[PDB]
Amino acid sequence: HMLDPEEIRKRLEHTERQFRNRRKILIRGLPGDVTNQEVHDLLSDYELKYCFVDKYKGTAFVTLLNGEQAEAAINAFHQSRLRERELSVQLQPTDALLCVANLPPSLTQQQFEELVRPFGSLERCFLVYSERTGQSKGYGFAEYMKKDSAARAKSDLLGKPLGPRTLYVHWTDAGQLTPALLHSRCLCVDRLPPGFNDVDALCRALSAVHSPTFCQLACGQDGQLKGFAVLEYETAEMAEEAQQQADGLSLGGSHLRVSFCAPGPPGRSMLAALIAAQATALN
Amino acid sequence: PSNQPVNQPILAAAQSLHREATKWSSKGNDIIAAAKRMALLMAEMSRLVRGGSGTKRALIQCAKDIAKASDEVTRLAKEVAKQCTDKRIRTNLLQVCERIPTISTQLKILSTVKATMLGRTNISDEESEQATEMLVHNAQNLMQSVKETVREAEAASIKIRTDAGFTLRWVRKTPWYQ
């Protein structure tokens, strides 16, 4: 059921506002005798929510009101001079960002907030949608105020059943993300026929629009099937197009379920990680 | 080596709770851990009610152990309900778990009744059989209430307040793919 242009724009804008809500900066290169006041004076045009100045290291950890203030402070003071010291002003390299994948595609942004909110205060929380249809890609990102919150979330969500799905959780480097890199190049195929042993017929079926660069069945050290397959396509547009025609397609008397993987890793890394997660949980 | 005679209805009720609880990991879920002990205790009860050496004292203690594990399931379910933002789930959870202490008190009383009969020889077969039936009905009610609590606590896990206090972990012990 196709979404009206107003709903598509509403979803994509919410995801864009959420993705851009990075308001924590890190200042390095401060003079040895710097004071808290000097840092407050430097950033007097902005509203400081938090400011810790480490006098022993020449660094400051500052939380500004929003992402717009953070970018403005960065542009204004990155590589500027403070009493002849060159300053580095960059987004804080926090480690509290998770990708929650294999979500039901019907799961709403509100339901995704309800799922990830009990573990702590959220800095960023958004589903990733198709730019063309506005439909959810079945994965989202949650960034907490604290790393301990994200660890607690990953522990409770990794291998959690939600509808006809088992969620996957992957720690993501906030620094490695861009709006383009939010769109996954990997697909996950499950609902294979029982005792499926024809990988070639699977890669061909999944080659109907675009040819995958990677296509392997998941299997343990003893070679036995783990229940799924991982595929990789050259681009995000190619993976999205392949997923659209292949999802629900009949193969060997079974209607395949084709989903998106967490957007970061290549096929080989994704396949090993998904096998590892399931094995750890079963044993 | 020697397959002990059991009460099949109390064993089937125990096995049904065990099936339900082993769908989940016990790590970060003390309800699941307690539910798993209740099932193995209820499986011991299916052997105890058939009589034998020292079964009087054993049956009384087994119902006390089941009641202690029940108390824990109820304590934990009330901690989950206190963090739940959905009125319907919160109400179901509190309703479905407040009956558990009542059923376990009746199980301790019904265990003592049957235990006192195992220790005697002047009790009629009809009386002995109905004392077992009462334990059967109680055990079925208790295993059902614990399955219901486990289902409502799990349904609540996605309806918890922001930055909550107490939460339970719901991670499957069954294959992840379809």
GROMACS .gro file of C-alpha atoms in nm:
model
  461
    1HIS     CA    1   0.000   0.000   0.000
    2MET     CA    2   0.178   0.313  -0.144
    3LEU     CA    3   0.233   0.615   0.085
    4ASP     CA    4   0.117   0.965  -0.011
    5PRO     CA    5   0.404   1.217  -0.090
    6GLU     CA    6   0.323   1.405   0.235
    7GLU     CA    7   0.386   1.092   0.450
    8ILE     CA    8   0.709   1.006   0.255
    9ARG     CA    9   0.843   1.362   0.314
   10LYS     CA   10   0.731   1.354   0.683
   11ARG     CA   11   0.925   1.026   0.750
   12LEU     CA   12   1.246   1.122   0.559
   13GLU     CA   13   1.256   1.464   0.732
   14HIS     CA   14   1.217   1.308   1.077
   15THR     CA   15   1.501   1.061   0.999
   16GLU     CA   16   1.719   1.359   0.869
   17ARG     CA   17   1.651   1.573   1.185
   18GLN     CA   18   1.728   1.270   1.405
   19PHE     CA   19   2.047   1.173   1.216
   20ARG     CA   20   2.174   1.536   1.244
   21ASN     CA   21   2.113   1.558   1.626
   22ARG     CA   22   2.485   1.531   1.720
   23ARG     CA   23   2.543   1.812   1.975
   24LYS     CA   24   2.853   1.690   2.167
   25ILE     CA   25   3.186   1.846   2.063
   26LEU     CA   26   3.544   1.767   2.163
   27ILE     CA   27   3.802   2.049   2.179
   28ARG     CA   28   4.175   1.957   2.178
   29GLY     CA   29   4.494   2.166   2.178
   30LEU     CA   30   4.388   2.407   2.459
   31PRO     CA   31   4.668   2.601   2.641
   32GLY     CA   32   4.822   2.431   2.946
   33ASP     CA   33   4.692   2.706   3.183
   34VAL     CA   34   4.341   2.720   3.019
   35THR     CA   35   4.049   2.783   3.261
   36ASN     CA   36   3.684   2.665   3.247
   37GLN     CA   37   3.597   3.037   3.211
   38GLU     CA   38   3.820   3.074   2.897
   39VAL     CA   39   3.621   2.784   2.735
   40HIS     CA   40   3.286   2.936   2.843
   41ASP     CA   41   3.414   3.272   2.703
   42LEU     CA   42   3.525   3.106   2.372
   43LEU     CA   43   3.176   2.945   2.330
   44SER     CA   44   2.973   3.246   2.467
   45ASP     CA   45   2.758   3.257   2.145
   46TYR     CA   46   2.625   2.904   2.226
   47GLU     CA   47   2.413   2.746   2.505
   48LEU     CA   48   2.635   2.504   2.706
   49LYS     CA   49   2.453   2.211   2.867
   50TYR     CA   50   2.776   2.048   2.985
   51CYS     CA   51   3.138   2.155   2.984
   52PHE     CA   52   3.425   1.958   3.134
   53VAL     CA   53   3.771   2.097   3.086
   54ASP     CA   54   4.059   1.853   3.132
   55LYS     CA   55   4.353   2.087   3.233
   56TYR     CA   56   4.605   1.797   3.230
   57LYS     CA   57   4.533   1.709   2.863
   58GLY     CA   58   4.424   2.038   2.697
   59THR     CA   59   4.080   1.897   2.611
   60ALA     CA   60   3.718   2.000   2.669
   61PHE     CA   61   3.401   1.788   2.646
   62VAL     CA   62   3.113   2.022   2.558
   63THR     CA   63   2.741   1.939   2.507
   64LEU     CA   64   2.560   2.214   2.318
   65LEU     CA   65   2.179   2.268   2.277
   66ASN     CA   66   2.146   2.097   1.933
   67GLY     CA   67   2.333   1.974   1.620
   68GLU     CA   68   2.313   2.322   1.456
   69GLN     CA   69   2.510   2.475   1.747
   70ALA     CA   70   2.768   2.191   1.734
   71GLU     CA   71   2.831   2.244   1.355
   72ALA     CA   72   2.842   2.623   1.405
   73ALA     CA   73   3.104   2.585   1.689
   74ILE     CA   74   3.309   2.344   1.471
   75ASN     CA   75   3.310   2.576   1.167
   76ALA     CA   76   3.387   2.881   1.388
   77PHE     CA   77   3.670   2.727   1.596
   78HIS     CA   78   3.817   2.416   1.426
   79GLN     CA   79   4.182   2.504   1.337
   80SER     CA   80   4.141   2.852   1.499
   81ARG     CA   81   4.408   2.995   1.732
   82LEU     CA   82   4.353   3.037   2.110
   83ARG     CA   83   4.654   3.228   2.253
   84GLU     CA   84   4.868   3.088   1.962
   85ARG     CA   85   4.742   2.727   2.015
   86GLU     CA   86   4.576   2.562   1.713
   87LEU     CA   87   4.252   2.410   1.829
   88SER     CA   88   4.084   2.095   1.702
   89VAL     CA   89   3.706   2.121   1.739
   90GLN     CA   90   3.521   1.812   1.624
   91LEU     CA   91   3.210   1.602   1.703
   92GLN     CA   92   3.278   1.393   2.015
   93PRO     CA   93   3.379   1.037   1.921
   94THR     CA   94   3.111   0.871   2.143
   95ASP     CA   95   3.053   0.492   2.136
   96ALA     CA   96   2.682   0.466   2.215
   97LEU     CA   97   2.537   0.406   1.865
   98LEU     CA   98   2.357   0.087   1.769
   99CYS     CA   99   2.200  -0.049   1.459
  100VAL     CA  100   1.891  -0.258   1.538
  101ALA     CA  101   1.822  -0.472   1.233
  102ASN     CA  102   1.567  -0.736   1.121
  103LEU     CA  103   1.282  -0.523   1.254
  104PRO     CA  104   0.932  -0.606   1.121
  105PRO     CA  105   0.888  -0.374   0.812
  106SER     CA  106   0.545  -0.271   0.956
  107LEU     CA  107   0.714  -0.140   1.278
  108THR     CA  108   0.651   0.238   1.305
  109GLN     CA  109   0.899   0.504   1.419
  110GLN     CA  110   0.689   0.536   1.741
  111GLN     CA  111   0.707   0.154   1.807
  112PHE     CA  112   1.086   0.161   1.744
  113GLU     CA  113   1.119   0.442   2.005
  114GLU     CA  114   0.913   0.224   2.251
  115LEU     CA  115   1.148  -0.077   2.188
  116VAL     CA  116   1.482   0.112   2.242
  117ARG     CA  117   1.387   0.384   2.497
  118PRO     CA  118   1.382   0.177   2.829
  119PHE     CA  119   1.766   0.137   2.830
  120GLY     CA  120   1.845   0.506   2.865
  121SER     CA  121   1.811   0.862   2.737
  122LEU     CA  122   1.818   0.872   2.356
  123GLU     CA  123   2.025   1.127   2.166
  124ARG     CA  124   1.923   0.994   1.818
  125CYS     CA  125   1.650   0.746   1.731
  126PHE     CA  126   1.538   0.682   1.376
  127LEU     CA  127   1.423   0.422   1.129
  128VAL     CA  128   1.584   0.410   0.782
  129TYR     CA  129   1.327   0.438   0.501
  130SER     CA  130   1.337   0.401   0.122
  131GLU     CA  131   1.379   0.754  -0.038
  132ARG     CA  132   1.148   0.636  -0.324
  133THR     CA  133   0.857   0.470  -0.132
  134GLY     CA  134   0.897   0.602   0.228
  135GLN     CA  135   0.861   0.241   0.347
  136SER     CA  136   1.081   0.124   0.635
  137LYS     CA  137   1.391  -0.083   0.544
  138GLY     CA  138   1.343  -0.283   0.864
  139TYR     CA  139   1.635  -0.133   1.058
  140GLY     CA  140   1.701   0.171   1.268
  141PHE     CA  141   1.959   0.350   1.478
  142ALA     CA  142   1.958   0.423   1.852
  143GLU     CA  143   2.224   0.647   2.015
  144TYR     CA  144   2.217   0.689   2.388
  145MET     CA  145   2.358   0.962   2.616
  146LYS     CA  146   2.580   0.689   2.784
  147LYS     CA  147   2.773   0.383   2.646
  148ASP     CA  148   2.641   0.171   2.939
  149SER     CA  149   2.279   0.231   2.808
  150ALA     CA  150   2.374   0.112   2.455
  151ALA     CA  151   2.545  -0.202   2.606
  152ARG     CA  152   2.228  -0.277   2.810
  153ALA     CA  153   2.014  -0.223   2.493
  154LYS     CA  154   2.235  -0.452   2.276
  155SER     CA  155   2.228  -0.724   2.549
  156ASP     CA  156   1.842  -0.721   2.570
  157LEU     CA  157   1.769  -0.669   2.195
  158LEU     CA  158   2.028  -0.905   2.035
  159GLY     CA  159   1.830  -1.218   1.958
  160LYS     CA  160   1.501  -1.071   2.084
  161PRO     CA  161   1.185  -1.203   1.904
  162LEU     CA  162   0.956  -0.924   1.770
  163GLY     CA  163   0.667  -1.048   1.558
  164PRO     CA  164   0.790  -1.314   1.311
  165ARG     CA  165   1.152  -1.179   1.349
  166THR     CA  166   1.462  -1.214   1.569
  167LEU     CA  167   1.639  -0.878   1.608
  168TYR     CA  168   2.007  -0.829   1.529
  169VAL     CA  169   2.217  -0.562   1.703
  170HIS     CA  170   2.542  -0.423   1.570
  171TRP     CA  171   2.762  -0.147   1.737
  172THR     CA  172   2.814   0.125   1.472
  173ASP     CA  173   3.083   0.397   1.452
  174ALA     CA  174   2.888   0.731   1.443
  175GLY     CA  175   3.191   0.876   1.255
  176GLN     CA  176   3.163   0.617   0.974
  177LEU     CA  177   2.800   0.728   0.894
  178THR     CA  178   2.670   0.963   0.626
  179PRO     CA  179   2.308   0.994   0.494
  180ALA     CA  180   2.411   0.774   0.193
  181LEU     CA  181   2.589   0.506   0.405
  182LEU     CA  182   2.262   0.468   0.608
  183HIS     CA  183   2.137   0.251   0.315
  184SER     CA  184   2.259  -0.109   0.331
  185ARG     CA  185   2.423  -0.292   0.039
  186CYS     CA  186   2.357  -0.638   0.203
  187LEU     CA  187   2.048  -0.856   0.205
  188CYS     CA  188   1.951  -1.141   0.437
  189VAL     CA  189   1.749  -1.429   0.292
  190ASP     CA  190   1.567  -1.680   0.515
  191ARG     CA  191   1.247  -1.901   0.476
  192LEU     CA  192   1.456  -2.132   0.254
  193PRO     CA  193   1.300  -2.477   0.167
  194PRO     CA  194   1.372  -2.741   0.442
  195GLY     CA  195   1.709  -2.910   0.379
  196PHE     CA  196   1.794  -2.643   0.110
  197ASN     CA  197   2.121  -2.734  -0.066
  198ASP     CA  198   2.122  -2.535  -0.395
  199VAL     CA  199   2.308  -2.202  -0.336
  200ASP     CA  200   2.340  -2.147  -0.715
  201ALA     CA  201   1.960  -2.147  -0.769
  202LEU     CA  202   1.931  -1.890  -0.486
  203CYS     CA  203   2.199  -1.650  -0.627
  204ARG     CA  204   2.032  -1.676  -0.977
  205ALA     CA  205   1.680  -1.597  -0.833
  206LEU     CA  206   1.838  -1.300  -0.653
  207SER     CA  207   2.017  -1.197  -0.982
  208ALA     CA  208   1.681  -1.117  -1.160
  209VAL     CA  209   1.742  -0.736  -1.140
  210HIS     CA  210   2.110  -0.697  -1.041
  211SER     CA  211   2.389  -0.950  -0.991
  212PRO     CA  212   2.520  -0.987  -0.632
  213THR     CA  213   2.898  -0.935  -0.563
  214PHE     CA  214   2.862  -1.185  -0.268
  215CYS     CA  215   2.612  -1.475  -0.219
  216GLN     CA  216   2.666  -1.750   0.044
  217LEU     CA  217   2.460  -1.985   0.258
  218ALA     CA  218   2.521  -1.953   0.632
  219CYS     CA  219   2.674  -2.262   0.783
  220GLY     CA  220   2.857  -2.378   1.099
  221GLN     CA  221   3.212  -2.522   1.124
  222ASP     CA  222   3.056  -2.870   1.049
  223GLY     CA  223   2.909  -2.726   0.718
  224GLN     CA  224   2.543  -2.763   0.834
  225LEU     CA  225   2.296  -2.480   0.745
  226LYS     CA  226   2.227  -2.199   0.994
  227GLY     CA  227   1.889  -2.110   0.832
  228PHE     CA  228   1.983  -1.813   0.613
  229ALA     CA  229   2.196  -1.657   0.333
  230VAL     CA  230   2.376  -1.321   0.300
  231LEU     CA  231   2.411  -1.135  -0.031
  232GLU     CA  232   2.589  -0.814  -0.121
  233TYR     CA  233   2.527  -0.585  -0.418
  234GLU     CA  234   2.761  -0.319  -0.568
  235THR     CA  235   2.539  -0.028  -0.450
  236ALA     CA  236   2.257   0.052  -0.199
  237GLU     CA  237   2.017   0.125  -0.493
  238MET     CA  238   2.100  -0.220  -0.639
  239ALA     CA  239   2.037  -0.400  -0.301
  240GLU     CA  240   1.706  -0.205  -0.253
  241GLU     CA  241   1.589  -0.292  -0.613
  242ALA     CA  242   1.685  -0.665  -0.569
  243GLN     CA  243   1.506  -0.679  -0.229
  244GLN     CA  244   1.186  -0.526  -0.380
  245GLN     CA  245   1.144  -0.795  -0.654
  246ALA     CA  246   1.286  -1.096  -0.458
  247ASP     CA  247   1.090  -1.065  -0.128
  248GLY     CA  248   0.819  -1.336  -0.116
  249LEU     CA  249   0.943  -1.507  -0.440
  250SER     CA  250   0.884  -1.883  -0.464
  251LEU     CA  251   1.192  -2.108  -0.465
  252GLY     CA  252   1.181  -2.486  -0.404
  253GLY     CA  253   0.823  -2.478  -0.273
  254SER     CA  254   0.895  -2.194  -0.027
  255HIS     CA  255   0.822  -1.819  -0.036
  256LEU     CA  256   1.158  -1.652   0.044
  257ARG     CA  257   1.183  -1.369   0.294
  258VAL     CA  258   1.440  -1.107   0.174
  259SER     CA  259   1.543  -0.835   0.427
  260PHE     CA  260   1.817  -0.572   0.460
  261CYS     CA  261   2.124  -0.634   0.682
  262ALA     CA  262   2.274  -0.366   0.918
  263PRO     CA  263   2.436  -0.116   0.669
  264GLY     CA  264   2.801  -0.120   0.771
  265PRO     CA  265   2.991  -0.446   0.698
  266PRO     CA  266   3.058  -0.636   0.371
  267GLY     CA  267   2.893  -0.974   0.306
  268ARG     CA  268   3.176  -1.187   0.449
  269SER     CA  269   3.183  -0.989   0.780
  270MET     CA  270   2.798  -0.974   0.805
  271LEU     CA  271   2.759  -1.354   0.748
  272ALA     CA  272   3.023  -1.445   1.012
  273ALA     CA  273   2.870  -1.200   1.270
  274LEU     CA  274   2.512  -1.329   1.220
  275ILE     CA  275   2.631  -1.693   1.253
  276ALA     CA  276   2.834  -1.602   1.566
  277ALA     CA  277   2.532  -1.416   1.732
  278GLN     CA  278   2.289  -1.710   1.673
  279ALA     CA  279   2.546  -1.978   1.789
  280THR     CA  280   2.633  -1.781   2.112
  281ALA     CA  281   2.257  -1.744   2.189
  282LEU     CA  282   2.173  -2.118   2.113
  283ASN     CA  283   2.470  -2.240   2.326
  284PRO     CA  284   1.742  -4.721   3.514
  285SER     CA  285   1.405  -4.812   3.675
  286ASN     CA  286   1.133  -4.584   3.521
  287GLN     CA  287   0.939  -4.454   3.821
  288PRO     CA  288   0.554  -4.450   3.811
  289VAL     CA  289   0.430  -4.093   3.769
  290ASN     CA  290   0.102  -3.901   3.763
  291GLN     CA  291   0.082  -3.821   3.386
  292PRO     CA  292  -0.147  -3.509   3.427
  293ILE     CA  293   0.097  -3.345   3.678
  294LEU     CA  294   0.396  -3.438   3.454
  295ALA     CA  295   0.226  -3.303   3.134
  296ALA     CA  296   0.150  -2.970   3.320
  297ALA     CA  297   0.524  -2.951   3.435
  298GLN     CA  298   0.658  -3.032   3.089
  299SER     CA  299   0.430  -2.767   2.938
  300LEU     CA  300   0.573  -2.501   3.173
  301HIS     CA  301   0.929  -2.630   3.099
  302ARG     CA  302   0.866  -2.605   2.721
  303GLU     CA  303   0.739  -2.246   2.758
  304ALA     CA  304   1.027  -2.133   2.982
  305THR     CA  305   1.309  -2.304   2.780
  306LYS     CA  306   1.205  -2.092   2.474
  307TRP     CA  307   1.400  -1.815   2.662
  308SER     CA  308   1.742  -1.747   2.807
  309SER     CA  309   1.766  -1.724   3.191
  310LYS     CA  310   2.052  -1.464   3.163
  311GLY     CA  311   1.890  -1.134   3.273
  312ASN     CA  312   1.553  -1.301   3.338
  313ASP     CA  313   1.490  -1.436   3.691
  314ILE     CA  314   1.123  -1.512   3.602
  315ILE     CA  315   1.250  -1.763   3.340
  316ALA     CA  316   1.507  -1.905   3.587
  317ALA     CA  317   1.229  -1.947   3.856
  318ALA     CA  318   0.976  -2.086   3.602
  319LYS     CA  319   1.237  -2.349   3.497
  320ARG     CA  320   1.287  -2.459   3.863
  321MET     CA  321   0.905  -2.475   3.918
  322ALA     CA  322   0.870  -2.711   3.617
  323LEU     CA  323   1.144  -2.949   3.746
  324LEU     CA  324   0.987  -2.933   4.098
  325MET     CA  325   0.639  -3.003   3.950
  326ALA     CA  326   0.800  -3.299   3.757
  327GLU     CA  327   0.929  -3.426   4.101
  328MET     CA  328   0.574  -3.385   4.241
  329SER     CA  329   0.436  -3.620   3.963
  330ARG     CA  330   0.667  -3.891   4.110
  331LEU     CA  331   0.607  -3.806   4.479
  332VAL     CA  332   0.221  -3.829   4.472
  333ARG     CA  333   0.258  -4.202   4.365
  334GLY     CA  334   0.394  -4.281   4.714
  335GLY     CA  335   0.713  -4.453   4.828
  336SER     CA  336   0.983  -4.428   5.097
  337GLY     CA  337   1.008  -4.082   5.260
  338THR     CA  338   0.758  -3.929   5.012
  339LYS     CA  339   0.545  -3.774   5.297
  340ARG     CA  340   0.822  -3.526   5.404
  341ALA     CA  341   0.945  -3.490   5.042
  342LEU     CA  342   0.599  -3.395   4.905
  343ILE     CA  343   0.545  -3.134   5.179
  344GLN     CA  344   0.891  -2.975   5.107
  345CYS     CA  345   0.842  -2.993   4.723
  346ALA     CA  346   0.518  -2.781   4.749
  347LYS     CA  347   0.705  -2.536   4.979
  348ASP     CA  348   0.987  -2.506   4.719
  349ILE     CA  349   0.728  -2.452   4.438
  350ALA     CA  350   0.559  -2.178   4.656
  351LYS     CA  351   0.895  -1.999   4.711
  352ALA     CA  352   0.966  -2.000   4.333
  353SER     CA  353   0.603  -1.874   4.274
  354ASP     CA  354   0.668  -1.586   4.519
  355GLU     CA  355   0.971  -1.482   4.313
  356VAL     CA  356   0.775  -1.497   3.977
  357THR     CA  357   0.506  -1.267   4.137
  358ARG     CA  358   0.761  -1.023   4.294
  359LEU     CA  359   0.939  -0.981   3.958
  360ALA     CA  360   0.617  -0.956   3.750
  361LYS     CA  361   0.496  -0.669   3.985
  362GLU     CA  362   0.839  -0.491   3.933
  363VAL     CA  363   0.783  -0.517   3.550
  364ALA     CA  364   0.420  -0.387   3.575
  365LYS     CA  365   0.546  -0.081   3.773
  366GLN     CA  366   0.766   0.025   3.468
  367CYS     CA  367   0.500  -0.052   3.198
  368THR     CA  368   0.327   0.244   3.020
  369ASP     CA  369   0.047   0.033   2.857
  370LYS     CA  370  -0.262   0.023   3.088
  371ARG     CA  371  -0.402  -0.298   2.923
  372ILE     CA  372  -0.075  -0.503   2.952
  373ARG     CA  373   0.004  -0.358   3.302
  374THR     CA  374  -0.348  -0.460   3.421
  375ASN     CA  375  -0.325  -0.809   3.258
  376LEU     CA  376   0.018  -0.868   3.415
  377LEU     CA  377  -0.097  -0.759   3.765
  378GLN     CA  378  -0.422  -0.961   3.745
  379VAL     CA  379  -0.262  -1.281   3.599
  380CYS     CA  380   0.017  -1.279   3.861
  381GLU     CA  381  -0.182  -1.182   4.184
  382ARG     CA  382  -0.360  -1.528   4.164
  383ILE     CA  383  -0.027  -1.719   4.183
  384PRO     CA  384   0.026  -1.682   4.571
  385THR     CA  385  -0.338  -1.808   4.622
  386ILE     CA  386  -0.275  -2.120   4.405
  387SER     CA  387   0.057  -2.195   4.578
  388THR     CA  388  -0.100  -2.165   4.929
  389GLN     CA  389  -0.363  -2.418   4.817
  390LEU     CA  390  -0.084  -2.644   4.677
  391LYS     CA  391   0.094  -2.648   5.019
  392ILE     CA  392  -0.237  -2.743   5.191
  393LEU     CA  393  -0.328  -3.004   4.924
  394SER     CA  394   0.031  -3.150   4.945
  395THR     CA  395   0.005  -3.195   5.323
  396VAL     CA  396  -0.338  -3.363   5.272
  397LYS     CA  397  -0.195  -3.612   5.019
  398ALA     CA  398   0.134  -3.660   5.220
  399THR     CA  399  -0.069  -3.750   5.535
  400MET     CA  400  -0.254  -4.009   5.318
  401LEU     CA  401   0.071  -4.161   5.175
  402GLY     CA  402   0.183  -4.214   5.538
  403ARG     CA  403  -0.142  -4.408   5.622
  404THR     CA  404  -0.313  -4.741   5.509
  405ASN     CA  405  -0.679  -4.698   5.636
  406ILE     CA  406  -0.767  -4.446   5.353
  407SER     CA  407  -1.013  -4.553   5.077
  408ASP     CA  408  -0.904  -4.562   4.710
  409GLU     CA  409  -1.173  -4.301   4.612
  410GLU     CA  410  -1.040  -4.062   4.884
  411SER     CA  411  -0.674  -4.120   4.786
  412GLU     CA  412  -0.757  -4.071   4.412
  413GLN     CA  413  -0.956  -3.749   4.467
  414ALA     CA  414  -0.676  -3.607   4.691
  415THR     CA  415  -0.446  -3.661   4.382
  416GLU     CA  416  -0.709  -3.503   4.147
  417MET     CA  417  -0.714  -3.191   4.365
  418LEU     CA  418  -0.330  -3.167   4.329
  419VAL     CA  419  -0.365  -3.232   3.953
  420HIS     CA  420  -0.619  -2.941   3.917
  421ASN     CA  421  -0.401  -2.713   4.134
  422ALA     CA  422  -0.073  -2.799   3.946
  423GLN     CA  423  -0.252  -2.736   3.607
  424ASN     CA  424  -0.380  -2.396   3.736
  425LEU     CA  425  -0.037  -2.305   3.870
  426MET     CA  426   0.155  -2.400   3.550
  427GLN     CA  427  -0.107  -2.210   3.344
  428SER     CA  428  -0.077  -1.887   3.557
  429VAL     CA  429   0.307  -1.896   3.530
  430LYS     CA  430   0.287  -1.946   3.145
  431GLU     CA  431   0.045  -1.645   3.135
  432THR     CA  432   0.275  -1.432   3.355
  433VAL     CA  433   0.575  -1.516   3.133
  434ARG     CA  434   0.367  -1.416   2.825
  435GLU     CA  435   0.239  -1.086   2.975
  436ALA     CA  436   0.586  -0.987   3.116
  437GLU     CA  437   0.731  -1.044   2.765
  438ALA     CA  438   0.449  -0.843   2.598
  439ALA     CA  439   0.528  -0.556   2.846
  440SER     CA  440   0.901  -0.552   2.752
  441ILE     CA  441   0.825  -0.335   2.447
  442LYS     CA  442   0.589  -0.101   2.651
  443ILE     CA  443   0.839   0.010   2.921
  444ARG     CA  444   0.896   0.377   3.024
  445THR     CA  445   1.203   0.569   2.896
  446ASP     CA  446   1.522   0.504   3.105
  447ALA     CA  447   1.340   0.253   3.327
  448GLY     CA  448   1.434   0.090   3.649
  449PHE     CA  449   1.388  -0.285   3.644
  450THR     CA  450   1.364  -0.470   3.308
  451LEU     CA  451   1.378  -0.839   3.209
  452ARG     CA  452   1.578  -0.971   2.909
  453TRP     CA  453   1.375  -1.165   2.643
  454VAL     CA  454   1.624  -1.349   2.417
  455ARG     CA  455   1.520  -1.672   2.244
  456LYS     CA  456   1.684  -2.012   2.299
  457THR     CA  457   1.516  -2.144   1.978
  458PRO     CA  458   1.644  -2.104   1.610
  459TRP     CA  459   1.628  -1.740   1.493
  460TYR     CA  460   1.529  -1.794   1.129
  461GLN     CA  461   1.216  -1.927   0.958
   0.00000   0.00000   0.00000
